[PDB]
Design a protein around this nucleic acid. Structure first.
Length: 49
DNA sequence: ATTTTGTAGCTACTTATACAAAATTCAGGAAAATTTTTCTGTATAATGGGAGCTGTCACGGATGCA
């Protein structure tokens, strides 16, 4: 699923998120670069790749 | 005219004492008996775990900063 959202101004990132049935997750987004990070749990990770 | 009252009396007569050893039991001891708790070894070889959780807040900090 995807959830995007705003900053305090209107910087409107997005995200993404995955859920297995069972097993860990995979998170994504866009942090005022437009450039992104494969977070795993909440924000566990964060990699341009 | 007996009877109850007597008085002047005891003796029998029986508590009372106090001791008293004898019981007679009791407790504690002592084992000793034994039951239960401990202690120790074990030889092919063996060499990083488990989990997940993922929806407030705040604040003060937040040093960290670019």
């Amino acid at each position: 699923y995807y959830k995007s959202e705003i900053d305090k101004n209107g910087r409107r990132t997005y995200s993404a998120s995955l859920i297995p049935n069972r097993g860990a997750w995979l998170k994504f987004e866009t942090d005022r670069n437009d450039l992104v990070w494969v977070r795993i749990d909440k924000t566990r990770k964060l990699s341009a790749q």
